Write an enzyme that holds these catalytic residues in place. Structure first.
Site, PDB file in Angstrom:
ATOM      1  N   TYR A  38      51.345  16.512  10.006  1.00  0.00           N
ATOM      2  CA  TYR A  38      52.560  15.566   9.982  1.00  0.00           C
ATOM      3  C   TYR A  38      53.509  16.200  10.562  1.00  0.00           C
ATOM      4  O   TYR A  38      54.363  16.090  10.679  1.00  0.00           O
ATOM      5  CB  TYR A  38      52.364  15.345   8.842  1.00  0.00           C
ATOM      6  CG  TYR A  38      53.583  14.332   8.199  1.00  0.00           C
ATOM      7  CD1 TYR A  38      53.995  13.609   8.407  1.00  0.00           C
ATOM      8  CD2 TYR A  38      54.309  15.321   7.345  1.00  0.00           C
ATOM      9  CE1 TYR A  38      54.593  13.244   7.705  1.00  0.00           C
ATOM     10  CE2 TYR A  38      55.066  14.993   6.433  1.00  0.00           C
ATOM     11  CZ  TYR A  38      55.349  13.733   6.757  1.00  0.00           C
ATOM     12  OH  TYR A  38      57.105  13.312   6.449  1.00  0.00           O
ATOM     13  N   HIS A  94      59.542   5.866  10.989  1.00  0.00           N
ATOM     14  CA  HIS A  94      57.893   5.227  10.659  1.00  0.00           C
ATOM     15  C   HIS A  94      57.137   6.185  10.968  1.00  0.00           C
ATOM     16  O   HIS A  94      57.544   7.208  11.701  1.00  0.00           O
ATOM     17  CB  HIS A  94      57.676   4.430  12.353  1.00  0.00           C
ATOM     18  CG  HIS A  94      57.700   4.759  13.247  1.00  0.00           C
ATOM     19  ND1 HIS A  94      59.365   5.125  14.518  1.00  0.00           N
ATOM     20  CD2 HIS A  94      57.144   5.541  14.254  1.00  0.00           C
ATOM     21  CE1 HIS A  94      58.866   4.929  15.183  1.00  0.00           C
ATOM     22  NE2 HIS A  94      57.909   5.973  15.393  1.00  0.00           N
ATOM     23  N   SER A 124      54.554  17.394  14.055  1.00  0.00           N
ATOM     24  CA  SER A 124      55.437  16.014  14.253  1.00  0.00           C
ATOM     25  C   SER A 124      56.542  16.694  14.385  1.00  0.00           C
ATOM     26  O   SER A 124      57.703  16.388  14.714  1.00  0.00           O
ATOM     27  CB  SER A 124      54.324  15.429  14.374  1.00  0.00           C
ATOM     28  OG  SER A 124      54.385  14.736  12.962  1.00  0.00           O
ATOM     29  N   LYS A 125      57.077  16.466  12.764  1.00  0.00           N
ATOM     30  CA  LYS A 125      58.151  16.710  12.411  1.00  0.00           C
ATOM     31  C   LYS A 125      59.448  17.949  12.451  1.00  0.00           C
ATOM     32  O   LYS A 125      60.312  17.937  12.944  1.00  0.00           O
ATOM     33  CB  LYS A 125      58.279  16.701  10.677  1.00  0.00           C
ATOM     34  CG  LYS A 125      57.952  15.323   9.960  1.00  0.00           C
ATOM     35  CD  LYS A 125      58.958  13.961  10.513  1.00  0.00           C
ATOM     36  CE  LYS A 125      58.714  13.177   9.551  1.00  0.00           C
ATOM     37  NZ  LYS A 125      59.192  12.030   9.680  1.00  0.00           N
ATOM     38  N   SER A 147      61.134  15.363   7.572  1.00  0.00           N
ATOM     39  CA  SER A 147      61.040  15.976   5.696  1.00  0.00           C
ATOM     40  C   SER A 147      61.787  17.240   5.505  1.00  0.00           C
ATOM     41  O   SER A 147      61.429  18.575   6.581  1.00  0.00           O
ATOM     42  CB  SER A 147      59.391  15.409   5.298  1.00  0.00           C
ATOM     43  OG  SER A 147      59.147  16.168   4.843  1.00  0.00           O
ATOM     44  N   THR A 154      53.014  -1.375  17.536  1.00  0.00           N
ATOM     45  CA  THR A 154      52.649  -0.596  17.429  1.00  0.00           C
ATOM     46  C   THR A 154      53.159   0.396  17.398  1.00  0.00           C
ATOM     47  O   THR A 154      53.404   0.149  19.393  1.00  0.00           O
ATOM     48  CB  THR A 154      51.280   0.444  17.436  1.00  0.00           C
ATOM     49  OG1 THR A 154      50.929   1.687  16.923  1.00  0.00           O
ATOM     50  CG2 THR A 154      49.929  -0.482  18.336  1.00  0.00           C
TER      51      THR A 154
END
Ligand SMILES: NC(=O)c1ccc[n+]([C@@H]2O[C@H](COP(=O)([O-])OP(=O)(O)OC[C@H]3O[C@@H](n4cnc5c(N)ncnc54)[C@H](OP(=O)(O)O)[C@@H]3O)[C@@H](O)[C@H]2O)c1
Ligand SMILES: NC(=O)c1ccc[n+]([C@@H]2O[C@H](COP(=O)([O-])OP(=O)(O)OC[C@H]3O[C@@H](n4cnc5c(N)ncnc54)[C@H](OP(=O)(O)O)[C@@H]3O)[C@@H](O)[C@H]2O)c1
Ligand SMILES: CCCSc1nc(N2CCC[C@@H](CC(=O)O)C2)ccc1C(=O)NC1CCCCC1
Ligand SMILES: CCCSc1nc(N2CCC[C@@H](CC(=O)O)C2)ccc1C(=O)NC1CCCCC1
Lengths: 255, 253
Positions: A158, A95, A161-162, A145, A67
């Site tokens: 998300y 990941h 973080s991106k 993304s 992990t």
């Protein structure tokens, strides 16, 4: 300008390679005859991937399960992978922690986990890999993304973080430019891809196989950004020329 | 269309108000006759700021010293502040951890600290404030930078944190639009400003006094973004129409 030979005998780490785009990238690198080290939490799915890599003609294929929530695992992973290949030519940070499309209420633990797995672990992997990448004049590939460039509902943690990956890697890319560190940084801006994860979590998805090949091609060609979307319109609009001017107007004024 | 009277009697939290832009915002809100609750680490400075606020004609001025590294303090502060004013009309998230303009080597603790103070604490403050802001049909003001829109060397951890604020707040703004939550989110894109912090760290920087008034004006007028820079040319280059189109391309659906 890309030739599959550019990857023959190359030492490559691919994170998030038990499934999705990651698994596809690992298979493409294998068909090109590269040395690959793959990782994910799942040992059994990883095994299946490694054997299939050797079947496609990989110079070597190995796996290390774990992990990326654990920062010491991230550190020790790069060390063992490096040991296996005798060095590192390309680092593919791909990941992501499990997320669902949902409205944001009060899940602070989830914002933290995403920031840790999707962002800090990438920084930790980079720091660990940097001495080896400096030797080979290597490449760092950061899989992001459209949600990491633009704002959509249901993906707040998300997206954060991106977006964070863009700020960090884009700034270190400027530092490597001035410091004269010959290590390339590629940020990949992808739209919806036809991965089983995405298909279940969520228009027209783009094929995972071509998406995989593009990420590798961009990294190999030392491109700053890679765009991959099912639309012609979306790709035209991905680019931010004002940002480039703003950035470049600073460097051509101080450096 | 901004009128100072729009802030008279309003309940406002200002974080990072012991110095810089934060202190200036607290003074402007005080001149307009608002109820202000200020926070930072520095207790003796916050005292001096609070008394000066009352001298400018603030309806009330209070402080709660503490560190935004501590997520329970962030939580506790909003309740305590909300109890003091009997509600909340505007939340100004402005604080930042100390950074120096150095090249990045291996300081992972520093990347983490910045992400915690500059980003996580903003999210934690928002969650806590959201029930009160829903009642008043309030406003959230997020103070960001040009370094949080564009890439510069020497500010990697800081840029990452500011970029993260954009992704998070810009996405929740889309969620509030669909959920029909009447709470506005204002992201402030500032260039260099003439604050001691900046003048020590790094150069024709913009005045903090006007910068402070603009942030408040933008928040009050419920604008999505606020731009403040010493260059007209830079100001023109900050808008991202392609991003807007991509965002709205989705919306329909
Ligand atoms: N698919 C799309 O529509 C899309 C769009 C834009 C961008 N992207 C980006 O493309 C990349 C690949 O996504 P994908 O669609 O291929 O997703 P995916 O199929 O869910 O793959 C994610 C990978 O990460 C692993 N993983 C999960 N939790 C982990 C943890 N804590 N530590 C380490 N590894 C962990 C997963 O396997 P284990 O369960 O075995 O641990 C898997 O190998 C991501 O960076 C994503 O953000 C995808
Ligand atoms: N000035 C510029 O050039 C510039 C450029 C772009 C954007 N901005 C943005 O404008 C805002 C204000 O910046 P500024 O230049 O006015 O900075 P500043 O003078 O350094 O003020 C930051 C504030 O945050 C507080 N703070 C620092 N560490 C903290 C911690 N761990 N916990 C809680 N509070 C903490 C400080 O008080 P204590 O030490 O008392 O806690 C202070 O009141 C920031 O969001 C910054 O990113 C400024
Ligand atoms: C509301 C959906 C936001 S998520 C998201 N949206 C994207 N858009 C919005 C919908 C239309 C779409 C059209 C396109 O391809 O041009 C572009 C593109 C990519 C992602 C993304 O990276 N999704 C993740 C979610 C977590 C699991 C991994 C995959
Ligand atoms: C290389 C320096 C990067 S820092 C930085 N640079 C900015 N640029 C680059 C220099 C020229 C400048 C010109 C302008 O006003 O248009 C635009 C704008 C804002 C910041 C910023 O947020 N500064 C923080 C740093 C930590 C301490 C608090 C203040």
């Amino acid at each position: 300008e890309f030739r599959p030979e550019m990857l023959q005998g190359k030492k490559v780490i691919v994170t998030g390679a038990s499934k999705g785009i990651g698994r596809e990238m690992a298979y493409h690198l294998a068909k090109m005859g590269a040395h690959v080290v793959v990782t994910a939490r799942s040992k059994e799915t990883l095994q299946k991937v490694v054997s299939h890599c050797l079947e496609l003609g990989a110079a070597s294929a190995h796996y290390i399960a774990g992990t990326m929530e654990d920062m010491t695992f991230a550190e020790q992973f790069v060390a063992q992978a490096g040991k296996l290949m005798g060095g590192l030519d390309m680092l593919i940070l791909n990941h992501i922690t499990n997320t669902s499309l949902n409205l944001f209420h009060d899940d602070i633990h989830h914002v933290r986990k995403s920031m840790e797995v999707n962002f800090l672990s990438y920084v930790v992997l980079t720091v660990a890999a940097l001495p080896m990448l400096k030797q080979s004049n290597g490449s760092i590939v950061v899989v992001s993304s459209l949600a990491g460039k633009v704002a959509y509902p249901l993906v707040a943690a998300y997206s954060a973080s991106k977006f964070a990956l863009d700020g960090f890697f884009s700034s270190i890319r400027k530092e490597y430019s001035v410091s004269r560190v010959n290590v390339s940084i590629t940020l990949c801006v992808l739209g919806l891809i036809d991965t089983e994860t995405a298909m279940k979590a969520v228009m027209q998805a783009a094929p995972k196989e071509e998406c995989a090949l593009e990420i590798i091609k961009g990294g190999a060609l030392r491109q700053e950004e890679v765009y991959y979307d099912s639309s012609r319109w979306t790709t035209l609009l991905i680019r931010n020329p004002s940002r480039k001017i703003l950035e470049e107007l600073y460097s051509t004024s101080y450096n």
